[PDB]
Symmetry: C4
Subunit: 397 residues, 4 copies
């Protein structure tokens, strides 16, 4: 959407994974202070998003929906003021249905009223779910009209609010939602697992009528590669929250997860604990050079160039004629992987000079690997990535 927001993908943190329905004012305020104090804020993670279970049990006579008075004894607005004081922005969650996924009151048919409430509170960001939608889906037009009702509602408040769709790829939001929202979930929810299939996440492709949840990292990657082509500044594919630090994956698996989310220009919303961040977690989420790929001014997702057995190659443009290249090894053992210049710049063929000498930097290690021509061969860990920046292009005029 052309609303001045999400010019690059949004970055932030969300209450759900850590706090769930135990979310309250004090936990949110402590997390926001940890986000600021740890350095995450200055790295770019500036949205603090209050997920499901903030809601009071019933709407007011006035029809507005206030926050639970026990969890939020001052109401939401004074909490948002405290977040704003930290130099952070505040997000809120609802659903495009009668109820949220957690069974709380949601916004279908109350879009104007709820948007007005959030604007009054100082909310800067809405995550808008797809539970209990009363059969208002199944065609792009049905889903469009329902999400457009809230998009219009937000707009009319006059307050800029980042509009994050959460409809799990149903009816193709990469087609229908691109001018009316800032980002759209493309799949069922990720879980803290690298590649285990699950019956609650039956779909393996972008084309899905039951998005579900418990979708592995690899499941989501195979869906994302089809829809990257639709992503633009202000309008991103959302691969769901980052699981880094939660413990169900190893470090190389988290590195893969973070790398691909970053390079495909997903929003980078932390779905973890920010109050006790281990060195292992900091290594993955606080690398400025990797963040700079996600936040790159060319606004282009990396493309998947090939799949060879369990190996995958990604390649994308970055600013100033540079290139991001990712070797991904989905196999159970470490492997030597090779990227050729003709593959890295495949879409430019035949206008590629394979003999061109180019400096390659390893962005995780934050070191130059030196100059290479023709191809590069590197060790890639099991379930692992090597994330490379080419400091020039082999493309011929």
């Amino acid at each position: 959407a052309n609303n001045g927001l999400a010019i690059t993908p949004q970055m932030g943190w969300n209450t759900w994974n850590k706090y769930g329905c135990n979310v309250d004012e004090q936990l949110i305020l402590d997390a926001a202070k940890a986000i600021a104090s740890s350095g995450l804020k200055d790295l770019g993670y500036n949205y603090v998003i209050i997920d499901d279970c903030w809601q009071k049990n019933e709407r007011e006579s006035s029809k507005t929906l206030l926050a639970d008075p026990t969890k939020f004894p001052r109401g939401i607005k004074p909490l948002v003021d405290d977040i704003h004081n930290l130099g952070l922005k505040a997000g809120i969650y609802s659903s495009a249905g009668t109820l949220t996924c957690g069974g709380h009151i949601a916004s279908l048919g109350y879009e104007d009223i709820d948007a007005k409430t959030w604007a009054k509170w100082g909310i800067d960001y809405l995550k808008y779910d797809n539970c209990y939608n009363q059969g208002q889906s199944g065609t792009p037009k049905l889903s469009y009209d329902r999400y457009k009702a809230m998009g219009n509602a937000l707009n009319k408040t006059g307050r800029p609010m980042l509009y994050s769709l959460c409809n799990w790829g149903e009816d193709g939001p990469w087609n229908f939602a691109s001018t009316i929202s800032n980002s759209w979930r493309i799949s069922g929810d990720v879980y803290d697992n690298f590649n285990r299939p699950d019956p609650a996440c039956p779909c393996t492709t972008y084309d899905c009528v039951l998005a579900g949840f418990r979708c592995s990292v690899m499941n989501i990657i195979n869906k994302a590669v089809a829809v990257s082509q639709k992503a633009r500044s202000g309008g991103w594919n959302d691969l769901d929250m980052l699981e880094v630090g939660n413990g169900g994956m190893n470090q190389e698996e988290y590195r893969v997860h973070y790398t691909i989310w970053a390079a495909l220009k997903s929003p980078l919303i932390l779905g973890n604990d920010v109050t006790n961040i281990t060195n292992t977690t900091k290594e993955i989420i606080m690398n400025k050079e990797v963040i700079a790929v996600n936040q790159d001014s060319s606004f282009s997702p990396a493309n998947r160039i090939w799949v060879k057995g369990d190996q995958q190659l990604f390649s994308g443009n970055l600013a100033n004629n540079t290139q991001v290249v990712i070797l991904l090894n989905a196999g159970d053992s470490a492997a030597k992987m090779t990227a050729t210049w003709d593959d890295i710049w495949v879409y430019n063929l035949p206008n590629v000079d394979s003999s061109r000498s180019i400096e390659v930097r390893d962005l995780w290690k934050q070191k130059s690997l030196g100059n290479f021509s023709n191809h590069i061969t590197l060790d890639v860990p099991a379930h692992g990535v090597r994330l490379l920046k080419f400091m020039d292009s082999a493309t011929s005029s």
Copy 2:
């Protein structure tokens, strides 16, 4: 739906399989008395559901549809009074179409009138079919509006009536029907057969435009595992009626059928003979410990954790930190099957203590198997199950 009904899955018995179109007042009354006298009523099977072929050949001038005067010489109301006197509840069948599946007058366009008639009769339960729907399906919205017309009609009578959808999973009722009905058929009709495929049941997955009938037990299980995630108190996936005792399956096959229907929180509607219940049938349908799994206060279906060849593992939470675990052997020969603690509590990883010693009870045998740590290995019959309750959890804080 939030109408105070089906807080746990409904249990009962239906006239179709035994009586079909020969259904009449006396057969229903004899079955209700057998349900009460055999102990089935006190076990929880309290709904007596009159299926298709009760209808008079034409509507009254008043537009109401009365019962066939030969089959029901006093009308339906006095029969419902007799059922109520036995401490039982009464159900009736119609279709969301111009005709029922049996070709009798049905309720499309007459929803208010028919609901009013049923309320006057004292009906407590509606099974609402999907035959002859005049093309009013193919999107979630089309099917939603048609089923919502009857949901609203029932509601406005002021009489609580359990609303059982019978649209065979068309357009995803687990999404559209969850706030407007109490349960929804997810597949084409079961038949008295464990695993034989049939051309009238072509679909093998939840995503289906021709649900059909003659779907085997195993066919239905493979569909159900995708949609369990949507089930909630008051709003259940319905795997169709129980075939136990009809004779086309052996005892271990019926045990599997009953176990999975119970653990996936399907309604448990007996589709059999209640006037002559063999010891073999009683063993399967009158086990209080198995019924207690279906009726568990946590209201959670068991999840399918893995498929390994013809073997399947299910695991789900029960009340007071206990767990239901099912080993299912779909192979033609008995096998030793193993469940590990890490698999049983997979969604909790890494917060699982595999060394935790826990008592395991066999619910069919109704005996403690003793304490186990790490894994359990058991003999499982061909087309068979072992149904286990873990008396504590291995989950770590």
Copy 3:
């Protein structure tokens, strides 16, 4: 539909395959006289259906569409009178679109006017195509409304006209069309070929968005077996016209084609030459015992019981407790095939007596094969059938 017509499947002959766009008054009249004189009329083939290319180039100022004055110099009505005089009924073709498949003026938006014209002419039968439908398809509701407009138009003339849908299975007419029409094409058009696949007939199952044409006999059979379950007196699945005698198949292939169309209760519309009928053709299309299966008073299609490699078994009820059984050998060489009593009456299990001695008749040979118990084993030609009638049932009370 409940309009008194197609109580059994319709039988007849259609101008297209033989005459195409060269159709005219004299050719139709000569074919009708051949139908009467050859004995086809008295066998049951009583509809003479005028297919595409009868139309005048433009509608009248009055908006009616008359017949081409060169091809039909007296108009259609006097030709229909001549057909009626032969004891035959007359059919006409149009499309539910702006143009017919041949590019002539069709009936979308003119349904009342065109139905009125046909009734005035004495037409008894409409074949109603799906070409040029202006995007009015893609959901059951879209296709339903378009076909309902003509169904209503025909009805209001007061003249009984058999309503034959020709929408090639799009959006599932076996669901939507069953109360508003007498029969519905379920697939793209057959061609004179037993099993050759073709890119114009890409779909292999009932679920299809491009029905196309050049669908082989075997292609159509594999689609039909899914939808047989929906067929009822007055409302039939239509497997398209019979190719018998056209020359692109051998006699055993035509026997298979005719047998399956007959036993699945398809309309039997001859799509061949009736003015020169060879002995080989008469053997296939003039066998009263095979016609009696199609016209059986139980109105039930035979069901496909199994597929074993290239072999298929069909079994269905006939009147007076008899059974039709078909062994079908889709393989390139003759084979001995076996049907067991438990398979023939599979849906009745366990209530089947496999030792029951029953007389079996070969309907093509028109001879008793004697009595059998348990199973029957017979020689079946390449691409061939054996068509059997069991003179009693093995089903136990």
Copy 4:
């Protein structure tokens, strides 16, 4: 559509591939002069189509959308006059959405106004894209209504304008668009590559909800063969622009690409450089005998008769009882391929004389191969074709 245009498939050249967003008045005028001077105009390539990025940044107060004043300092009309003076016709691009694929102002909701502007400018041809369509797709009816709005808008100007749909096969334009437009894209965009699969072009068949781009030549061919059956004079399947000369394919690959596009009666729109045409390019795009196949008066696409491993046979009618035959070798090595008379005229079986002696001409070589009976065997290069004309038919009366 019956608007007097595209009686044979349109031929021309499009600005996108060569000039992209650097398109301007002078480059267009130089290309039009090269088209005329090189002989391309007189061969039939007479449309000069201005693609995306011509647009001014905002609409006028009057609501019309003018051209970028820097790129087009005289406006579009005087440029169209210059094109007309060369004996050429002018085309323009927009999208059926709020924005074009390049992010410029597009025509949804402004169809009458924009059509009026183009008619005033003297535009003869519209390419009408499917980007940013606001969820107005997903059924044939949704897409139909959106494309019909522009079709009607063009018509009402009174100026004949060739209406080229560019919706990439979404919702089946071969069904819905055939009477309201002159041609319809059937797939995601071609790229300069013979057979490399790409994740942005996930679909391999005509049935697709994400058409994407980077579809190889072979990918598009496998889609086209399903829909050829729908093509008619004035209403063509569009296989996207010709890549010939761009360099990412070899000469035999381009020959295959051009041959199949020509024989399937695709529009032949050059998507290359016309200002420097190599001898290798001229050999492929300036062969009058191949163009004569595309422009043949029988207006019939060739049909794919078989696929045998990596080999394919195409056969179609041409004027005066002649036949086009194509042997296509998609394998990596040259092969001897055989076409039999029974396969070439398969749809005429059994009325084919395989012994019929017929002269066969090689259209690329422009030489007679002499007379053949029964079959022909020829060398076919890797990724290659042999394009044949049979000077008579083997079909028997």
